[model samples]
Target: DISDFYQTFFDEADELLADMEQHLLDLVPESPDAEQLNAIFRAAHSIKGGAGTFGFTILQETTHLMENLLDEARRGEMQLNTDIINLFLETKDIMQEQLDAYKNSEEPDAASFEYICNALRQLALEAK
Candidate 1:
């Protein structure tokens, strides 16, 4: 059973989140390094891929969105700013919260999830 090792997914997800944390903090939104941007995108890509494979909708949804956002940044379609980085940090924090809750076999805060979804979408529209 693949479910036999789903905890492995949580384990690897945490590792990716840690890498993302450093990359996000190291970022200079005023003049971002494109390679650092790719690091962040690929981390989100892994997180999104794992979540989708295991069917965790909330995590999958948030990770997918940041994927698009970073994809835009990597493509030179959007400019990064302090405000944008702040949003990414916030999203990163919430993603970890969700991950921890799931590891503990509990549901994360629904309201927080709802708020972050809207926040990211609003930011996305503003970026566009």
Candidate 2:
């Protein structure tokens, strides 16, 4: 049942978000672990994939940006700094709010959505 799987999405997404959060907290900007970077990317990748599969466009949109930034960091294209991590943490927080809104049959906060997306967009451009 597709509806049945919605709960699964929430469950797995929660776990992925938590794992990603922990990794972000432990990361050292100057000397990041490659395996940890990969793990973090995988977590966002999984979340985005599942979100798209389940028609969670709000979740997909946010995770897509996150995945991009994380990908760059993973490939050694972007310098990992405390500010970058802080932005990522803020992204995660917004994602959680989006999740909560969807879970309760409400739309995500539009202002926060635009603000965070633009913030991430600028970061991506700057990182490049």
Candidate 3:
């Protein structure tokens, strides 16, 4: 019943991740496209909302952190450099892995989770 929510969230999140990567890859450091950045923000925000509602605390928090990062990039406070794009791509893949671990009934991988979170956290904190 309610358990179906996780799968739904995963599906929708994956879609967003796809869009984010597509747009993120096209960004040019300090010259990110406004519409593309907005798209990424919206996608991550949606995933965060669904993640929170579906019992995936780590996923929720991770996406929450990503949402903040996207927000900064949206505001032009953080430049959309190659490092940012690479980290975001890595984050998207790590999220997919986490979702898979949950589906397989295994404990989510904390090391990878924290690694991405720590990276995003640094970016978020540096946003002024």
Candidate 4:
């Protein structure tokens, strides 16, 4: 990542995640909101590109996984809940931490990284 590229990606990515976060919390009826899903999907799309560009494999794969999930849910207007959102927030928070670590020039803790992979994979399996 070039000097300018790193900060630019992180700053823009932080806003996107924080932006989508509000809508995620807004789901009490827990149904897929069209705008919300697309925003998250678009958020996912953005992060995947930035992650890939920066060579952040965990972030890239995490967002890519969610991109698939949101699209599937988007297609049929599927179920969601505090539970699902928690898993999602699990993913989201890690991205933020990973973002933090990357910006600080460190790798995220190995322990933290491992389970998010499992969580998204579990949700992804449930999506199937």
Every model: Cα RMSD to truth: 1.0, 1.0, 1.6, 1.7
- Identify the leading candidate in terms of lDDT: 1
- What clash count goes with each model? 0, 0, 0, 0
Model 2, range 1-128, lDDT digits (tens) per residue?
67677777888888888998999999998889999999999999999998898788888999999999999999999998999999998998898888888777788898898999999999999987
**Candidate order by TM-score, highest to lowest?**
2, 1, 4, 3
In candidate 2, the residue pairs with backbone N, CA or C atoms under 3 Å apart (3 or more residues apart, or in different chains) clash, namely: none
TM-score per candidate: 0.95, 0.95, 0.89, 0.89
State the TM-score for model 3. 0.89
> Over 4 Å off in model 2, which ranges?
none
Model 3, residue 91: displacement in angstroms? 1.1
Kindly indicate the candidate among 1 and 3 with the higher lDDT: 1
lDDT by residue for model 4 over 24-107, one digit each (tens)? 777553556677777877888898999998788877877887777767766754577778887777778888888888888888
Q: Judging by lDDT, tell me the better candidate of 3 and 4.
A: 3
lDDT tens digits by residue: candidate 3, 1-128? 78866676667777887887888788777777799889989988987888778777777788888888888889877777788789888987887777777677676789988899999988776654
Alpha-carbon deviation at 70 in model 2, angstroms? 0.4
* Pairwise TM-score winner, candidates 3 and 4: 4
Provide the global lDDT of candidate 4 against the true structure. 0.79
lDDT of model 3 at position 34: 91
The local distance difference test score of each candidate is 0.90, 0.89, 0.80, 0.79
Regions more than 4 Å wrong, model 3: none
Lowest summed lDDT over 10 consecutive residues: which window, candidate 4?
A: 23-32
